[PDB]
Design a protein around this ligand. Structure first.
Ligand SMILES: [Mg+2]
Ligand SMILES: [Zn+2]
Ligand SMILES: [Zn+2]
Ligand SMILES: [Zn+2]
Ligand SMILES: [Zn+2]
Lengths: 102, 49, 88, 511, 45, 96, 48, 64, 214
RNA sequence: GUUUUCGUUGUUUUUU
């Protein structure tokens, strides 16, 4: 269960090795990159366990920016910082990553 | 030393033996007390006095 | 160490069976290290000061954890004496 | 087999599939003593070996598991530990060997075992006495109380030899004081008392005619009728089983918001369950419960009238000595229940990983082993975390200072009544120990008069199955309780087996 | 060095606080020490 | 001082800290936890609960014979020996 | 035997309570009987 | 004698616990209930064998 | 700016039911999967989100609108205290429930895990990912006096010197820099790959030994 | 060379 940087959805590490991030893999390509990228985009340290089942009208979803993202476990805080390449690609594609650790 | 023992020897009234026995033959102790507060709150050293 | 003596102990830290014993006498010689030279401490077994006799049977075996584990039996006659109790 | 199924499930919609990870248990397998040396070498033991090297004379035990899958889209010999074994027993390595090899292993023949060797320490259990369970017990409560007589019974399941609950009744109202001579009941898992008529109506007999029939059987006893009359008068609001039940379910000590939907059913459950389970635990025999309750309340009313003696609580025939059987049974019962809890839980946080558990890494036999070890070595018949409220001194270090001291030590009893309140009945000798316990031998001071000893000819029952007795009764024209009429069977004999009402008969002499 | 003896086979053997304590001759796992070499007296009273 | 609550050596060197020291440390921890509450998320109910637990700890360290409420204990299952318990009783300081 | 065992303990309790009751009383140079507080009990010890 | 009972029962309307006040009035064999938050009241006949728990049970049986 | 996403009355309420200690994450995930599986069913659960926070250990809060939804959600869950120890969440603290909330080189830090715990360190490098950082400690070696570790049998600390290492028991790369025993030693100090988890920098007060050395 | 230390708390048993 490594907390994703961008969307925050968390799934068992096997899930990301094999099933991936439901929303960020399109731009983060965790399924199709070295495990270094998967771990950097999905850290094993996280805080603020938020279970989301309905996100379309949940205020928690609007605050957490997961109203569009698939309902599921989400982590409020993720420590560390993204390396240069991941954030550079995110900003090139127009995804201004907002760290959720504050 | 039993309670009834105290009772019996007080009926006798051997005050001095009582005090010394409960002091010399038990945990006698000396302390220092500040009269103003009347408590044992003194900070003492002897060789420095 | 203990105020009692250690000479009757053996070269291993034990005492031979059938040795005269007096109270306050170190019957088992055990030592423990000191958490950091001269880093050990007495762990001996003086005999009960009130109890004297002769060593009956000295056992040396390992406990369940496999560590050395002794069972030492001392013995002596009990002679009836003034004030000793008897009953019909 | 008291707890033979653990049922799991996994309705994963990730597509509703019910993966039932059910676990079943096979036969129990008991080994002979066989320790494992720290050298890894294993060998059968002997008590003297443990005495020398401070070990416990215990035998490894195996129970058979069974892991069964019921996945609908809509085991092995597991070493469970080692059980200390009382010497000379059928599992004892000294039971055999006759007179000779005992010499070779340096065993005194004059020892008769009967004790447990733990870490080289021979330990002796102390049997505890007790009144016989599931008995009607009416007593005159202290006059300074609205209660005048107290009918008491601790209902326990005959199978399993384990307490389940207790129910008590009280004659409310004083002689021409407290208004009428009413009666209200006390129940398990409740918080208030209820008029007895109400509990009759919730059990099927709402009309008072049937209630009186089941209660009063000499209609000529108008006195009985008028003591119960206030109970009948107050029993007019409730007129059917559902109101009686919701009424009862309103006081079931449960949560708030059960609503009459489920309140009536929970009330009926506690009318069936938790209530006289020794009589019946299923449906369709609440009539048997009504008849038995009527008999018990009739006894209570006779006692209130005092036409019969209050059942002498000191009458020893009611008392019962729990041998090691029931004691160890309950101890291992609680320990196995804890083992069930922990293993079933480990299934929960190990099936989530969906790893095929070996049924080996999950189980730690240390639970039962260490629990029994503590409860015996320290003698606390209970977990190390429930030291308080746990009977200590049940097990003791044996006596080998002299032969006969040990002898009595093996023929000693215990009275777990406590020293709270001096009193005289218990310590006092009562005629009803005639030929049962040593009249002269007893401790001194606090222990005097309470701990007892088996008389030279007293013998303890181990228990026998009861159904053949039922057949013998059925064999001999047993008259059922539903064929029981107050006038017809006015001189017949009510039938009781193991103390519970087991029919009617008119000519008991021949049978 | 020191003289010991087994309890089962009845054989004396000497260990030097280095060998794990096991019967040198029949594997019996309980050994013992022997009498001392000093002389013993008794008042016989 | 330590004189009141010194170290007891269950087995030669192995010393179990006196339960008085244990409960003193416990109350200091509860105090610090209350201290650690307000500068961060302290949504009232959390403050109330933590202070309630601190009060429970203090009362237990004073007395464990508080009627109507169960006793305080150590991991062993043994109820804590409150100061009152040390003081009163047939073995109390006075009588003992 | 039971009665003896009960009586010894109960009597010991009574004796303890009583001795606590009257542990300080004294006769004095005046011959009066007064307590630690000085409240006279008897105007004269045994009236004699 | 009236007996106001500020009970712990939770009322369904404003969903506030301890908001139900079960004031029993046996004089006319007629009960009374009050809420301090939404002021909902309940009525039910009360025999010599009715309690605030029975009254709350009747309220649940009636409203829902 | 999240401030325009502040909660209001129209937003679903939060009922905070406390659960058994250490089982709060278990209850969170139980609620998540129960809601997901029962979403769209004939008995749907009116819960919007479930969350637990480290500070509020034992406290579980679910975004919902009716107590019936919470009662059905927690029904069938054993890790929850039998009590309905739930208190309605006020408007202001809805965001305070999810509020998330220093390390630099050359900063004094302490070791916790392993055997070198309780030894002050000075950070001198940090890994790019933000997971591991290198340090500047006082090496603690027995010089072969007991090699042929644990955290409780160690002697005092001494600054590393080349002569002692040469004599008692060693690859000289740069002046004063020796990678000995899988450990880097610069300027007579200790350098090792220490995890960010193994270290802490906030609220550390130097001790008498540290002020004597540092 | 003078000098110099063993634990607790429980339990159960008896001792009058
Ligand atoms: Mg005598
Ligand atoms: Zn993502
Ligand atoms: Zn002063
Ligand atoms: Zn041999
Ligand atoms: Zn309301």
């Amino acid at each position: 269960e490594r907390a994703c940087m961008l969307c925050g959805i968390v799934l068992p590490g096997r899930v990301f090795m094999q099933n991936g991030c439901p929303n960020c893999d399109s731009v983060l390509n965790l399924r199709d990159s070295d495990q270094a990228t998967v771990n950097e985009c999905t850290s094993s340290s996280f805080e603020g366990l938020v279970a989301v089942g309905d996100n379309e009208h949940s205020w928690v979803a609007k605050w957490l920016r997961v109203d569009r993202f698939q309902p599921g476990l989400y982590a409020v805080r993720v420590d560390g910082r993204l390396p240069s390449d991941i954030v550079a690609a995110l900003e090139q594609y127009g995804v201004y990553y907002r760290p959720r650790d504050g | 030393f039993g309670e009834m023992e105290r009772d019996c020897m007080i009926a006798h009234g051997a005050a001095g033996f009582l005090k010394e026995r409960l002091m010399e033959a038990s945990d006698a102790f000396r302390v220092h007390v500040c009269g103003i507060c009347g408590l044992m709150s003194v900070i003492a050293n002897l060789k420095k006095n | 160490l203990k105020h009692g003596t250690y000479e009757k102990l053996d070269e291993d830290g034990l005492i031979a069976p059938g040795v005269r014993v007096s109270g306050d006498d170190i019957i088992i010689g055990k030592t423990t290290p000191i958490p950091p030279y001269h880093t050990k401490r007495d762990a001996s077994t003086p005999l009960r000061s009130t109890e004297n006799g002769i060593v009956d049977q000295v056992l040396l075996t390992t406990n369940q954890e496999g560590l050395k584990f002794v069972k030492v039996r001392m013995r002596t006659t009990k002679v009836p004496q003034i004030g000793d109790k008897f009953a019909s | 087999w008291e707890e033979p199924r653990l049922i799991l499930d996994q309705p994963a919609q990730h597509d509703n599939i019910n993966k039932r990870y059910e676990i079943r248990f096979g036969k129990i397998y008991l080994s002979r003593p066989t320790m494992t040396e720290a050298d890894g070498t294993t060998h059968a033991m002997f008590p003297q070996e443990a005495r020398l090297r401070n070990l416990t004379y215990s035998s490894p035990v195996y129970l058979d598991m069974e892991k069964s899958m019921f996945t609908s889209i809509d085991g092995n010999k597991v070493h469970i530990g080692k059980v200390p074994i009382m010497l000379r027993s059928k599992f004892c390595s000294l039971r055999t060997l006759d007179e000779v090899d005992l010499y070779k292993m340096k065993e005194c023949p004059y020892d008769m075992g009967g004790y447990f060797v733990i870490n080289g320490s021979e330990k002796v259990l102390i049997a505890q006495e007790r009144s016989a369970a599931n008995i009607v017990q009416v007593f005159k409560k202290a006059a300074p109380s609205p209660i005048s007589h107290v009918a008491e019974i601790r209902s326990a399941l005959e199978k399993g030899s384990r307490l389940i609950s207790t129910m008590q009744i009280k004659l409310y109202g004083r002689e021409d004081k407290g208004t009428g001579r009413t009666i209200k009941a006390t129940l398990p898992y409740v918080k208030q008392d209820i008029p007895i008529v109400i509990v009759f109506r919730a059990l099927g007999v709402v009309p008072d005619g049937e209630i009186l029939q089941h209660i009063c059987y000499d209609e000529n006893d108008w006195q009985m009728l008028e003591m119960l009359k206030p109970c009948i008068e107050e029993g007019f609001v409730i007129q059917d089983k559902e109101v009686a039940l919701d009424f009862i379910g309103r006081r079931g000590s449960a949560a708030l918001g059960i609503r009459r939907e489920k309140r009536i059913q929970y009330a009926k459950d506690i009318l069936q369950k938790e209530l006289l389970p020794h009589i019946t635990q299923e449906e369709g025999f609440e009539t048997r419960k009504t008849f038995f309750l009527g008999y018990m309340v009739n006894r209570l009313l006779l006692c209130a009238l005092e036409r019969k003696d209050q059942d002498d609580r000191d009458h020893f025939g009611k008392k019962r000595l729990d041998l090691a059987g029931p004691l160890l049974a309950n101890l291992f019962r609680i320990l196995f229940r804890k083992l069930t809890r922990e293993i079933y839980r480990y299934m929960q946080r190990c099936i989530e990983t969906d790893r095929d558990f070996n049924l080996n890494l999950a189980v730690k036999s240390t639970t039962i082993t260490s629990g029994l070890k503590y409860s015996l070595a320290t003698g606390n018949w209970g977990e190390q975390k429930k030291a308080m409220s746990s009977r200590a001194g049940v097990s003791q270090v044996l006596n080998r200072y002299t032969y006969s001291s040990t002898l009595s030590h093996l023929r000693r009893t215990n009275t777990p009544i406590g020293r709270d309140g001096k009193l005289a009945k218990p310590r006092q000798l009562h005629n009803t120990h005639w030929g049962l316990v040593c009249p002269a031998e007893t401790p001194e001071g606090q222990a005097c008069g309470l701990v007892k000893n088996l008389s030279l000819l007293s013998g303890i029952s181990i228990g026998s199955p009861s159904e053949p007795i039922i057949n013998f009764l059925e064999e001999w024209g047993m008259e059922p309780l539903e064929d029981y009429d107050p006038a017809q069977h006015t001189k017949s004999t009510r039938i009781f087996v193991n103390g519970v009402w087991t029919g009617i008969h008119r000519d008991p002499s021949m049978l | 060095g020191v003289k010991y003896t087994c309890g089962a086979c009845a054989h004396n053997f000497s260990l030097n606080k280095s060998d794990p304590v096991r019967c040198k001759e029949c594997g019996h796992r309980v050994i013992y020490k022997a009498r001392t070499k000093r002389m013993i007296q008794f008042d016989a009273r | 001082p330590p004189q009141v609550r010194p170290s007891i050596a269950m087995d030669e060197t192995t010393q179990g800290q006196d339960d008085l020291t244990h409960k003193l440390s416990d109350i200091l921890k509860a105090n610090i936890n209350v201290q650690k509450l307000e500068m961060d998320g302290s949504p009232q109910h959390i403050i109330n609960e933590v202070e309630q637990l601190l009060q429970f700890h203090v009362a237990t360290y004073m007395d464990n014979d508080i009627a109507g409420q169960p006793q305080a204990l150590q991991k062993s299952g043994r109820p804590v020996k409150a100061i009152r318990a040390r003081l009163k009783g047939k073995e109390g300081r006075l009588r003992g | 035997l039971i009665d003896t065992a009960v009586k010894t303990a109960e009597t010991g309790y009574i004796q303890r309570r009583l001795v606590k009751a009257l542990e300080d009383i004294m006769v004095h140079y005046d011959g009066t009987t007064r307590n630690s507080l000085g409240d006279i009990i008897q105007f004269l010890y045994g009236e004699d | 004698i009236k007996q106001k009972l500020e009970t712990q029962f939770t009322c369904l309307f404003c969903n506030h616990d301890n908001s139900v006040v079960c004031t029993l009035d046996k004089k006319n064999s007629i009960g009374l209930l009050e809420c301090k938050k939404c002021n909902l009241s309940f009525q039910a006949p009360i025999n010599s064998l009715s309690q605030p728990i029975d009254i709350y049970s009747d309220w649940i049986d009636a409203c829902e | 700016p999240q401030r325009l996403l502040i909660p209001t009355v129209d937003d679903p309420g939060i009922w905070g039911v406390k659960v058994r200690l250490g089982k709060e994450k278990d209850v969170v995930r139980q609620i998540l999967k129960k809601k997901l599986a029962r979403e769209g069913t004939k008995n749907p659960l009116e819960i919007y989100s479930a969350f637990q926070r480290d500070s509020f250990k034992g406290h579980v809060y679910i975004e919902a609108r009716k107590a019936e939804a919470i009662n059905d959600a927690l029904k069938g869950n054993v890790n929850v205290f039998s009590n309905n120890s739930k208190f309605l969440v006020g408007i202001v603290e809805y965001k305070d429930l999810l509020r998330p909330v220093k390390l630099t080189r050359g900063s004094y830090v302490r070791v916790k895990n392993g055997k070198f715990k309780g030894d002050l360190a000075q950070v001198d490098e940090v890994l790019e990912n933000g997971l591991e950082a290198r340090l500047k400690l006082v090496p603690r070696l027995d010089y072969g006096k007991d090699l042929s570790y644990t955290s409780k049998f160690r002697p005092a600390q001494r600054l590393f010197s080349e002569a002692e290492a040469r004599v008692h028991e060693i690859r000289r790369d740069r002046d004063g820099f020796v990678t000995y025993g899988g450990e880097e030693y610069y300027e007579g100090f200790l350098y090792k790959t220490f995890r960010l988890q193994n270290l802490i920098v906030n609220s550390i007060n130097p001790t008498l030994n540290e002020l004597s050395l540092f």
